[PDB]
Amino acid sequence: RQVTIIGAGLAGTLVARLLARNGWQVNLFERRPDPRIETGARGRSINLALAERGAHALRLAGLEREVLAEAVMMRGRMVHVPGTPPNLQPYGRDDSEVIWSINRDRLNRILLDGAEAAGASIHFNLGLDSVDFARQRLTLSNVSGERLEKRFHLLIGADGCNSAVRQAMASVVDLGEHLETQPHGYKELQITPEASAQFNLEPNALHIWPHGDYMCIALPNLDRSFTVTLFLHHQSPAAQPASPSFAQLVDGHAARRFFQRQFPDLSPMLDSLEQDFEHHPTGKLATLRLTTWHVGGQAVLLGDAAHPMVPFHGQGMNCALEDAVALAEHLQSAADNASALAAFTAQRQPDALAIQAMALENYVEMSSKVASPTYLLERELGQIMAQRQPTRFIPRYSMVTFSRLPYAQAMARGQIQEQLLKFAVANHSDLTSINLDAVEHEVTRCLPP
Ligand SMILES: Cc1cc2nc3c(=O)[nH]c(=O)nc-3n(C[C@H](O)[C@H](O)[C@H](O)COP(=O)(O)OP(=O)(O)OC[C@H]3O[C@@H](n4cnc5c(N)ncnc54)[C@H](O)[C@@H]3O)c2cc1C
Ligand SMILES: [Ca+2]
């Protein structure tokens, strides 16, 4: 059985391994050069957060141990707000509930090796330009545009948030796209190993500097450096042209003054702020929803190609790897490819919609400069319900991050929990006046184990 995959990223490489291992003849085409060919170019420092959904996908693929050996454990959140050295907010009760910070390039290289070890053939420096579905032929080209045509039988679009496969499908079907732009851009910055140690930055934690309409995060690297991401509006809104935005930060010097004013405890840690600000490109964020993910039995999308989401829940890669497991499962045991692609789409679409929604919602959580007293009291009561009924009351962030519960169910159960806590806390200023056993009875009544 033959399959062509476009995009040797995270989902495309994993699905290539899973199919090749199961006897498929896999050809994988990648626009970029092979990152395993060492050059004299600058290293790639972006990292991301691997959680249970992605880890489990790697586990099934037999690659989890190799990946985790190069990942830094993040035990909890370190929230930096002015005047108060932070304390770790642990993610869970022990080190089984942690998130892993992994270098993106290293992860991609491990997956590339894994796909080839299973028998897939990978062809780099070839970007998909167009698809002729009627003649079953692809057109690819290198950076110079030197075209090259290939016959295909099954086409998997694993080619990212600006997928060319998706574009080609839109020529033969109505994808029913809903693009929702995000006002934040993002900028990568760096904290050196020396600086992070000088300022006693905890390596085994995810760090956040909330600031309302903008914020910075930092994820650790194995060498104690941190990769920092600034999230900030591209443009200053209409009824407030003075508020910060990338448009005001015309160069590295301006970025420094902005950081010294708004992130005074972080600015000293960013030695190369000016250079990194001007060198690294400002990224764009968006949510894109597709009614249609496949064309008959001929082509299917997965990962960012199928459902771009904002990065504020750290689940895009995790979702994409979950996608890859499901697609290989359906393709392996379906009656035919068309049946597989329809069943895969029907299964995954409700969950993709849910994590897209929860990711949007999580920005307020991350960027909030202070938690209202009514927020802390609900959280505290939720903690208590979790101890009495660890089988029933599980905070939504934990369901999303540390379990494989389908995203949609996690969102629905979170809704029940949110309303339960809200009514239970209203008109009570502290825990001592809340009828705790009544709350638990409501938990048991409304949340099945
Ligand atoms: C700032 C930011 C932070 C994030 N943090 C996290 C996080 O902490 N945790 C998490 O789980 N997710 C995170 N994400 C999301 C995550 O990066 C993506 O969801 C994930 O990379 C998607 O995997 P993918 O394989 O579908 O696409 P990609 O990993 O992007 O792979 C696509 C591949 O296709 C190639 N390609 C593109 N176009 C073509 C073409 N025309 N022809 C051939 N090849 C092509 C690309 O070069 C690339 O190799 C973050 C995203 C952003 C923007
Ligand atoms: Ca994400």
Author numbering: 8 to 456
Copy the relevant paper text.
Kynurenine 3-monooxygenase (KMO) regulates levels of neuroactive kynurenine pathway metabolites associated with neurodegeneration. Downregulation of KMO activity shifts the flux between the two branches of the KP toward increased KYNA formation, thus generating a neuroprotective environment. The KMO reaction is a random bi–bi mechanism proceeding through a ternary complex of KMO-bound to l-KYN and NADPH (steady-state enzymatic assays are described in Supplementary Methods) with a turnover value, kcat, of 8.2 ± 0.2 s−1 and Km values for NADPH and l-KYN of 16.9 ± 1.5 and 12.1 ± 1.4 µM, respectively. We next determined crystal structures of KMO in complex with the novel inhibitors or with l-KYN to inform the design of small-molecule inhibitors capable of penetrating the blood–brain barrier.
Additional hydrogen bonding interactions are observed between the l-KYN carboxylate group and both Arg83 and Tyr97, as a direct consequence of the reorientation of both residues. Although the l-KYN aromatic moiety is located adjacent to the flavin isoalloxazine ring as previously reported, an additional water molecule is present that is located directly above the flavin C4a/N5. This is accompanied by a slight tilting of the flavin isoalloxazine. The position of the flavin isoalloxazine appears to be linked to the water molecule above C4a/N5 which, together with the adjacent water molecule located above the C10 atom, is likely to mimic the position of individual oxygen atoms in the proposed C4a peroxoflavin adduct. This suggests nucleophilic attack by the l-KYN occurs on the proximal oxygen, to generate a transient 3-oxo-l-KYN flavin adduct. Notably, l-KYN is known to stimulate KMO reduction by NADPH and other reported KMO inhibitors mimic this effect.
